[PDB]
Design a protein around this ligand. Sequence first.
Ligand SMILES: Nc1ncnc2c1ncn2[C@@H]1O[C@H](COP(=O)(O)OP(=O)(O)OP(=O)(O)O)[C@@H](O)[C@H]1O
Ligand SMILES: Nc1ncnc2c1ncn2[C@@H]1O[C@H](COP(=O)(O)OP(=O)(O)O)[C@@H](O)[C@H]1O
Ligand SMILES: Nc1ncnc2c1ncn2[C@@H]1O[C@H](COP(=O)(O)OP(=O)(O)O)[C@@H](O)[C@H]1O
Ligand SMILES: [Mg+2]
Lengths: 1411, 80, 465
Amino acid sequence: NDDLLKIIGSGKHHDQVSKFMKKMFGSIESIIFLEDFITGVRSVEGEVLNLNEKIELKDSIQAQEWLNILDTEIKLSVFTQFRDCLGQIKDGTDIEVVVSKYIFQAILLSAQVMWTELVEKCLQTNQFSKYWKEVDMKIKGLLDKLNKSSDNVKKKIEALLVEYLHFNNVIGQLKNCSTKEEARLLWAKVQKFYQKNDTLDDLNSVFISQSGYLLQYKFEYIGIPERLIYTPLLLIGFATLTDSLHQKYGGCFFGPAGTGKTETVKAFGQNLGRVVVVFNCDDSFDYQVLSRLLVGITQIGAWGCFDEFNRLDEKVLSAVSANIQQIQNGLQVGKSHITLLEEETPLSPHTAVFITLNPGYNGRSELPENLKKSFREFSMKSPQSGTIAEMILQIMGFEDSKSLASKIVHFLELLSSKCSSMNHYHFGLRTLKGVLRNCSPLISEFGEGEKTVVESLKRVILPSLGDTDELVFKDELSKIFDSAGTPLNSKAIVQCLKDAGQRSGFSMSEEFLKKCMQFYYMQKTQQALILVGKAGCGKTATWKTVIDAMAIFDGHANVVYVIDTKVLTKESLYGSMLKATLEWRDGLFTSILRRVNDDITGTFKNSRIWVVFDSDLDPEYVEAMNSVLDDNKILTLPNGERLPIPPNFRILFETDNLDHTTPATITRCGLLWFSTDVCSISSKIDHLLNKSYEALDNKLSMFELDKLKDLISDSFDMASLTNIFTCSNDLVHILGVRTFNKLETAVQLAVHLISSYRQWFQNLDDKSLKDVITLLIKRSLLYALAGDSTGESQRAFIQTINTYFGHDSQELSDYSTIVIANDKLSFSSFCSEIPSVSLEAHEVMRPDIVIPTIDTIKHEKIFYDLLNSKRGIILCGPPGSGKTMIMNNALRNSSLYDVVGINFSKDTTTEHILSALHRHTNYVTTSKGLTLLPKSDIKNLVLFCDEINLPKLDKYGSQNVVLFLRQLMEKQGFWKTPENKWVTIERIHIVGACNPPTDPGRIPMSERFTRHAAILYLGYPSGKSLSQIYEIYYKAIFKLVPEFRSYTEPFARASVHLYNECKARYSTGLQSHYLFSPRELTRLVRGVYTAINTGPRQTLRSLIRLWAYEAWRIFADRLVGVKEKNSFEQLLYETVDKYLPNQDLGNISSTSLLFSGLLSLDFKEVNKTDLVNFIEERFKTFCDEELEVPMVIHESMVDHILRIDRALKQVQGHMMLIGASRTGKTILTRFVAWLNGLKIVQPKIHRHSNLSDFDMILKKAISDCSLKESRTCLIIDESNILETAFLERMNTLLANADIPDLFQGEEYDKLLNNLRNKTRSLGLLLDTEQELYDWFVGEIAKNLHVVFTICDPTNNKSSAMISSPALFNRCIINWMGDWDTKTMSQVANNMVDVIPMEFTDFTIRDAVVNI
Amino acid sequence: DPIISRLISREFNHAGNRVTVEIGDHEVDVSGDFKLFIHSCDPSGDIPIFLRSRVRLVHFVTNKESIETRIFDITLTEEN
Amino acid sequence: YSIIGKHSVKIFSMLEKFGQFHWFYGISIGQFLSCFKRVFITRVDEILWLLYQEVYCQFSTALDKKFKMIMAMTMFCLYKFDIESEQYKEAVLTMIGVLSESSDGVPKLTVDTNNDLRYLWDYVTTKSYISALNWFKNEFFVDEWNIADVVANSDNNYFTMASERDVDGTFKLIELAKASKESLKIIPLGSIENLNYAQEEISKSKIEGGWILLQNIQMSLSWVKTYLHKHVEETKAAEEHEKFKMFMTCHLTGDKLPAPLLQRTDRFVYEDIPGILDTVKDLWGSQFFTGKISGVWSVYCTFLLSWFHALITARTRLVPHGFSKKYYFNDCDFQFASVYLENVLATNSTNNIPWAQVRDHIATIVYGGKIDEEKDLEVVAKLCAHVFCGSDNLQIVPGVRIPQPLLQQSEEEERARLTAILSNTIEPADSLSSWLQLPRESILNYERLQAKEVASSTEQLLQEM
Ligand SMILES: Nc1ncnc2c1ncn2[C@@H]1O[C@H](COP(=O)(O)OP(=O)(O)OP(=O)(O)O)[C@@H](O)[C@H]1O
Ligand SMILES: Nc1ncnc2c1ncn2[C@@H]1O[C@H](COP(=O)(O)OP(=O)(O)O)[C@@H](O)[C@H]1O
Ligand SMILES: Nc1ncnc2c1ncn2[C@@H]1O[C@H](COP(=O)(O)OP(=O)(O)O)[C@@H](O)[C@H]1O
Ligand SMILES: [Mg+2]
């Protein structure tokens, strides 16, 4: 309708219609005028057709009328140009003459008719040889004419070459036949184009024979479309299509995509002078448009092909399928008018319908039942390769195309049979199409010979082979064809490569030069390159080295864009369009093209542009740019453009695996398989040392540097390290990284430790100097090979180091230290010296408190040494092992570094990282790195990313958040996600903590990221250091009860024994939440203090019960069932008897010891009867005031109320309740909250709740807690966590004390403003932006209380709650999972308290309850 | 949806004459003439644990076990 | 009755599970009860066995030959496991385990103890499979119902027979009507005219009382869910209407019918497979109804095709050993081949030698069109090699020799002569190996596999209850 209306409206003008013709014709693009007259038309291909009669145009003419004349004349014009040409060649005129003056369609048809007639007669005579050479000459004639041609007519010659090759091929096959019968079989199968010189109706004069059947050429213009190369298989498709059509049946071929079933339908139409309309089905395609199109086809008598029919929706597909039957049933019968879409429309018998059927998930799709008896199904197969090889060789400039095609196929076939079975190996025809395509530029250098074939083989086949198969290639290449001894461009490139590496730092190894050479030779031909290998192969070195070497050799500048593919979304990278305003915004990959295409203001024309994708590559991303990888060399927008890419513009891909990618994607690109690392262990260190020396040159004098480099050279030789690196493998490596990728970690540490003691190197003894060096080198070499080891392994590796280093050289000790005087020169090595800490009662629990041990100082030192190197640190180990504390305290002490904690969860986004950072970081446009992201204050920043092996990965399996950090560690900046440019981060450091990846929940991380990190395995300590540590903790808290100062050590020893036993008795083998750590101890130690600091003077009997209650709440509340719960009761008994032997104890079961501050002004042990009665007076009240709910108060409930009470009382109160269903876990929480004076917030979520809604519910409860000082209790149920994100928000609220995402940007400024109002109100000004938010956070931490109610932890959704580390660690876990038999009887009693019943046999009430 | 939830668990906020219940946000008056029933078709579809526990679960399904009961009636009409 | 009762659930549970596997294999509880009621019009022991017999006789008809046999083996284990000894149970399970490839061992031999069971082991040990599979049916001692018998017993006006694409019971139904109650009305569901005429002839025939058939409903299905779904549900007055019977034809392999509609209507699986020679005779048979339009020499080619088609279709059944997968060749494929044959005689000389491109076109376009596996494509070809090239005497099958048109050149003589060669031949015992060139060894391998399928599925079904 729309386009139709424009044509009728634009009639006055006429000229405006040309745009719409391209659609309603398919062949033509625009119409040519003299304005009064139509001189001709042009095809979409570029070809100009002139009409016989130029159609005159006037005011009193309809669009209808004039266009209808055009259609008639356009077909007549084709007959004219056909007979004109055919007659010419009959009168022996050379085809080179004809080309220049006749449209391709016409000359094509003429050739076919004359060819066919000349071969028809050749079958009688058998004069094949003489016609053959004659045609072979026309072939060469057309080939040399192509090289001297205008690009437009260059298409016409090439299109005709498709045909003339087919001509000679058929004659050749005919020459070869054993007999005349053999020749007449072959001929029947071919498409024979005949003419009637007997009858009139000339548009009906040309007809075609195949397989005994005829098909009248309809005259319609086709333009000059790229013609399908003739294969036997092609002819067979043509043969079935004619056999179907002859009986008035539809053609249908099913087969794999990329078999060109529609191409065939297209081609077979063209061969008979028809433009077949292709319906690409299901591509947002309306039924109403197709119902239109169908009527159009049945009237115009056109050919319709349904391109991948299968992909249509059941509703559509029924409707379409039914319609098609009408048409095919109408034709089969020949009914003049047929009814479809409930309308009587007439049917041309020229009409035909074709259905291509791509396979579904099951296998090959099917026709609906109705269509089965109306169509004829055929199986498209890829062509046997030999045949396509020969033709492709023939077009380019043959030499002997027959033998090259034999030889190429045999070789590729032989490779497959002889090489190893490797995943990325393809010796499929795609590969020979590629070897052949690569050949064209190659011919330009050498010849149309086998030798150019040979070079193409080794250009494509070799770079993708791995060393074993690399000789299989050489052996069978020389076996099949031996071409040339030496290569051109052998010296000149090589010196341009070596000079680039000498400057880069690199060593020219056999392999680095090889893989450098393989690359150089590929960029030439291939525009897209793939580099695959082990992480740290040298791939970024090889390409960065070759690229650099070409600016020396050609003189052409390079402009490199390294993009981590998978850090950004497809929208962020390719082009994202926004729902409502449909605003087209650039993205990342398209915006950097616009510099080259749209605005080459500087030199981009003489420059080389290279766009590298470092990250793991997947289908979804390559599919969005498949068009650039195609012969097209153009980028297709999701909406609104194709952007052309120049020959300058190369795409690289560096990656570690290919498992995800398609063989189709590979064979468009050039693959460079890195079989091994480019260069020697030594050679790596060599480069690395020098690179490290350079850092120092900007903070160290030449005299200092010259002397320090002299030291390094004579302290360590390669012969030593060789065995040390060998022995490194004979060791158990947690978070394993290969030996080679450990080297940067070694040398960087070694250089830093030596440059540390540089002043002491001026005066010190030359024997003694060597020993200082050797010790630091022995140390740095240890942590870089064995730092991620057990340390039980480290100790054993220390001796391994000592062994292989020179015998005289200073040996390494477990706690080895170097000692020097502060103000006066001294030397000597003495070890293991520890400060003594005194802290008071209140100091006992503090977010920043660490008791120095033999190991705390040992760890803090090494961790800090790595930062000075500025290497990323990965701390691996179990929970409570002190990764967080060791890291935090080493840095909260120093003025240099400033810490920011980011806590990672199962699904963390890369913007979460950025939002958290936005409070502590400041964008400034300094000319040094364009945009920079340094820290908001002048001194260094450290991002501590906790649980780095927790975030999940793409459906393919790639964690972007990890790759983002990898980007930061390797690249040093990153691409801005919305604004789309490069920001280089200044002085920001990455440190991460993680659990072993053998632990459940844990995700394995990419060696491409972990290669940049020094890895430190921290375990648990001693069971004897722990006892020492918490003694000092009891010492501190017993400053409140000095009368029991004697009792601090047996208390600390008891606490640790209970720990050791619980951890051993109740492990993750029994229950997943059975996870104990020194965190519990510190909870117990503090839990004891709190009862003391707010309790009556404590007797020895009090204190042990006070300790016992805390031990119960910290270790046993989480325990399930009764067998384990009773086990702990006896354990607690067993422990007191071994460490605190007294006769004053009572019943130590949790039921009998009840501690509360609800009755008492102090936290004191209260009476069972006193408590029950206090609850009963308060529950009435809570029943009346709040929600009206009847319950029975029973022994368990009182015990449970106190559990929640202690939880909701602590500053940071997190408790998760596991209560099955009906236990009342939700009611008791509401009650204890109401007793403590907490506002009960319970997210009113529902089926139709968004994340934003829950965001709201959180945000409010947060804002009321700081800006209104609310003291709210937030009850979150398993039902409340609707999506995964909801729970992720809950984590951020626990592991950190704020949700950074909620308050960002403007909402940050509004909060920032409101915050200053309340801060002033309370009576303090806070100076910096950081100082105000730190109060806001600290206020949340003490006013917000999150209580979780999950019913079945067996459920996979409720599993995720417990799983989440943030929730599990910062919560008090409690178990209400079942009702005890005693509590069942107790409840039942109070319910049968009303007595309808009368005395019975036997108690009566007691008996009923027992049943 | 979660919101009905207070209507399922018998929770209410008392007045002299009026009895109110919280749904989503709005507090609405409960009649006393009001009755509630929940209907489902497929035992394949799982109802949330909160509901399942406060709700009186009743199966109106003609089972395989239905055949056992119905065959004895048919046997005994033809036997005694 | 609990003892009776417990058996009937495991029975119904088994029949129920067939419906999970395949859509056409439904059973309702009322079907089971109506069946159990029939059983009436140590007494508890007899009534039990009367059930298992009656269940077999009624519900067997609506399953295909594979499921008939799985139901037999399973039902036999459901009965004899409860009734007979535990000595029995492991002996028969050990034998079902040899028939499946689960295990192979020799059962309990007790002279005179068990003879029926000793007789089964003889079948399994003789590697004779189909006989061992049937033993479970026979052991029920029931006279197994013909579609006819089903129809006579049934008093419903509706029927749906599904069938494999290999056959159509359209012609069974013709002889079923003609032998009693006449009134045969075939209604093709093709295009809008057919559906439109169809729904007219439906409403009129029920009042009239004539039989009606709705050929190949699956294809016209969108209409079924709209018109037939309402129409058959509404027509409880069809019970009130004159003795009339409507039939519907399905294909098991193919689009799924609505369960509610299917359950309303009685179900049969036409499993009835014709001989090679009989299909030759059925093919050649119709070709005389045309009159005379083609010359004498063509009649020969048409006879050749009749053999060829009857040989490929027979080979279709035997997979894997035969064709790689199940391929279906139609009357449409015969038509396109005959079309090309008339044409090659119309375009060529009466010299016999046009034969080379007759092979290619028949083996690569006409029949090889569907075929996708190269392995199978060579089979079609090697058969065209045999059927199509040949001088004077062909010997299509070992008995029969096909002689080329005689100098007399009579087309009426030749029809009579080529019909005579059919009437003289008797299709041998071992036809599937002797006539389809493939060896006997392969046939047995096929026999073994279908044994394996029934024995596996029964093991699985027993453990499941
Ligand atoms: N010729 C050479 N001599 C010495 N060292 C070399 C040589 N070539 C490469 N290297 C070392 O190998 C490293 C090359 O790193 P590169 O980024 O190329 O590897 P990669 O496989 O791309 O790693 P990733 O995949 O993680 O980015 C350099 O750090 C360098 O120390
Ligand atoms: N040597 C120590 N000095 C002080 N506290 C310690 C020590 N060892 C363990 N802890 C306690 O254990 C907890 C350490 O847990 P953390 O390091 O956060 O676990 P992880 O790092 O495994 O996540 C702290 O709360 C602290 O009280
Ligand atoms: N001590 C008790 N006395 C009486 N009823 C109880 C008791 N504990 C739980 N219930 C019943 O079980 C249900 C659970 O209430 P709730 O407090 O929400 O626990 P949950 O969160 O486990 O459902 C309530 O409807 C209540 O009737
Ligand atoms: Mg890199």
